[PDB]
Amino acid sequence: FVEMVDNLRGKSGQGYYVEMTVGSPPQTLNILVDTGSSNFAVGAAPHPFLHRYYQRQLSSTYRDLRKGVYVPYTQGKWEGELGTDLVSIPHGPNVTVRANIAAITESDKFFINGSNWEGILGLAYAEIARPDDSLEPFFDSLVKQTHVPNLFSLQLCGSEVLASVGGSMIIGGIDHSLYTGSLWYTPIRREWYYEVIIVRVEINGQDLKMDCKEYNYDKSIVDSGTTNLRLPKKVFEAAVKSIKAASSTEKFPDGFWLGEQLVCWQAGTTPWNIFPVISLYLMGEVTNQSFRITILPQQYLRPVEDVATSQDDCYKFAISQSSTGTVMGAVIMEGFYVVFDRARKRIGFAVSACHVHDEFRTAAVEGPFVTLDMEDCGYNIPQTDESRSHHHH
Ligand SMILES: CN1C(=O)[C@]2(N=C1N)c1cc(-c3cccnc3F)ccc1O[C@H]1CCOC[C@@H]12
Ligand code: NI
């Protein structure tokens, strides 16, 4: 899969993108790789933050579906017109597919100034697609129309501009050069988000000792479209307390722990060893088994080069509170080669050949851990009448 290695780019904190082509003849666009959503949607009209956009009129193969799509979310919205066209990934499999494409005609707080992407590739399942689950997601179309195996894998690798990031999206396979050691699999609990189950959390080898359902309240997901590790409020508070205690030789402002302020040390003097490792134990394929993924402060403290003090190494705390469950975002994923094995309803983790570490500690994937009488750590989201009324033909 050499042709697919190093096919991802981006700016730190602004998401990883892949080059794609849309239409005939092919129009090149940079597309955000998002395992936390399920639409393929591209800028299709001028916008202050877009150097270019999908020109439907320039494509001989474009078909209008005569249907709009409106997608509000917490931080903003995008909307536009549904259609189909021919799509390929130049540094991906040598295939071309007819996929659904949402042509984004209006948006608010969606595009990011300087991120260098013009669209989004939702890699999650039909259940969370807009306007509804009848709009086939891109990967579903790719698998159905071609011989591409139903699996993809992601290796995300962590003064005037933001730091450039790189990585690999391997479509249809696993590239053994992208990881070392064992590849461990956790079940996909349900196919909507890439939902998983966390059974235990440790901070510097110390158990947080919470009811494990708290770790998955109201879900836990693997999301390339979230920068941070995000934790449910109660879990976040417990984690911050534990990380504070370990790093107590340093008194940081409240702003730091809120992710609203950088902390700095003189170049190359960052005291990494005062910050603890964080271990998330994930449910194994076997009953009563788990494995752990362990990340370093090199993952949860994001480097940000300050113009005023380029003399110093400065960092943002990249663990944050959630009210919508655990989000294993780029913070987690940058430690690991992550296999989205849709065919076998499981997600694989192995130590990434590109993860940032020091000579003392490393990001790790370790198991098995067995528990005599393992509890169900899954949370069951209260069923609304809205949701219950939906017919699923
Ligand atoms: C949480 N999350 C988002 O808000 C979302 N992708 C994820 N995963 C998303 C993430 C980003 C995004 C921002 C920074 C870093 N990485 C990213 F990817 C930008 C826009 C965006 O649009 C949302 C449109 C509605 O669906 C979700 C989409
Ligand atoms: Ni019906």
Question: Please, could you describe this protein's structure?
Answer:
- This protein has about 400 residues and is mostly beta strands.
- It folds into two domains: about 15-150, Beta Barrel (Cathepsin D, subunit A, domain 1); about 150-393, Acid Proteases (Cathepsin D, subunit A, domain 1, Beta Barrel), CATH 2.40.70.
- It has six helices and 26 strands.
- The strands form four sheets. The chain has a six-stranded mixed barrel. It has a five-stranded mixed sheet with strand order 12-15-23-16-22. The protein has a five-stranded antiparallel sheet with strand order 14-13-18-19-26.
- Strand 5 and strand 6 form a beta hairpin.
- The longest helix has 14 residues, at about 235-245.
- The chain is globular and about 65 Å long.
- The relative contact order is 0.16.
- The chain binds the ligand CN1C(=O)[C@]2(N=C1N)c1cc(-c3cccnc3F)ccc1O[C@H]1CCOC[C@@H]12 and nickel (II) ion.
- Ligand 2EX binds near residues 75 and 227.
- It catalyses: Broad endopeptidase specificity. Cleaves Glu-Val-Asn-Leu-|-Asp-Ala-Glu-Phe in the Swedish variant of Alzheimer's amyloid precursor protein.
- This is Beta-secretase 1.
- One of its GO terms (molecular function) is enzyme binding.
- It is found in: Cell membrane; Golgi apparatus, trans-Golgi network; Endoplasmic reticulum; Endosome.
- Its main location: membrane.
Lateral arrangement of strands in the main beta sheet: 2-3-8-4-7-6
**CATH architecture descriptor name of the largest domain:** Beta Barrel
**Rg value:** 21 Å
Taking the alpha carbons of the first and last residues, their distance comes to 38 Å
Q: Helix count?
A: 6
The assigned structural class equals mainly beta
In total, how many domains does the architecture comprise? 2
Name the CATH superfamily classification of the largest domain: Acid Proteases
The amount of helix comes to under 10%
CATH topology of the largest domain: Cathepsin D, subunit A, domain 1
Give the overall form. globular
In the CATH scheme, the class of the largest domain would be Mainly Beta
Estimate what percentage of residues fall within beta strands.
35-45%
Which small-molecule species are bound to the chains here?
the ligand CN1C(=O)[C@]2(N=C1N)c1cc(-c3cccnc3F)ccc1O[C@H]1CCOC[C@@H]12, nickel (II) ion
Number of strands: 26
Q: How would a crystallographer describe the biggest sheet?
A: 6 strands, mixed, barrel
